[PDB]
Amino acid sequence: QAQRILEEARAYKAQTILEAQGEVARFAKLLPEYKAAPEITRERLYIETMEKVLGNTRKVLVNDKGGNLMVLPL
Amino acid sequence: QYIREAEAYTNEVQPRANGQAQRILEEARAYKAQTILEAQGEVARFAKLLPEY
Amino acid sequence: NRMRAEREAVARRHRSQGQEEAEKLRATADYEVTRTLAEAERQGRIMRGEGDAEAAKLFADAFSKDPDFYAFIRSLRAYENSFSGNQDVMVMSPDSDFFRYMKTP
């Protein structure tokens, strides 16, 4: 009973720590690379991320200066 | 017959309500107890996180 | 018919008295189980707090080297996850910076 719920929570805590460590280690090794070439890394990541998001979400590509639209939700 | 039947109905419902009443009271205690315990946990979490912030 | 009625009434009465005791005992069980469930939930939050509280120091000291850079990496990830589903409509303009290389060189 007692031990049961004790170890149960303890696992979540351990998972967080382990997950945190991994993410930290990834951002660690990558930080010096960014400092070496900030502009090049920024452009690469920026385009890589942008192509992924726009790859799925629909787009209009309509010209500005006209303020009218119909969201048409459901 | 109606009279005899009516008596049964009146008599029958009477212990029925008593049981339902005890449950209500017990449910309130549970809420109170559960609420208090929930606060402790949440409060403890906030306290631990506060120095980090 | 009178004897039947009075006897039948007493019978139903005796049956009904037992029924309320049952419910009373039933409700008592509910309370105690909930108490234990809540008790367990309390111990869980305590430990569940230590987890994120302990990890918060790792995130802070690690990412405290370059906040702007960490904001870039993290913010980009968020977009990919937020727009993952095909339930959005990005009404961009042709003048948009990302479309800077769509105008005749």
From TrEMBL, chain B:
Localization per record: Membrane
Job of this protein: HflC and HflK could encode or regulate a protease.
Homology family: Belongs to the band 7/mec-2 family. HflK subfamily.
Subunit note: HflC and HflK may interact to form a multimeric complex.
Protein's name according to its UniProt entry: Protein HflK
Origin species: Escherichia coli
Species lineage: Bacteria, Pseudomonadati, Pseudomonadota, Gammaproteobacteria, Enterobacterales
Gene that encodes the chain: hflK
Full protein stretch here: 263 to 315 of 419
Automatic annotation (TrEMBL), chain C:
Coiled-coil blocks: none
Function: HflC and HflK help govern the stability of phage lambda cII protein, and thereby control the lysogenization frequency of phage lambda. HflKC inhibits the SecY-degrading activity of FtsH, possibly helping quality control of integral membrane proteins.
Protein name according to UniProt: Modulator of FtsH protease HflC
Family, per entry: Belongs to the band 7/mec-2 family. HflC subfamily.
Residue window of the full protein shown: 245 to 349 of 354
UniProt-annotated location(s): Membrane
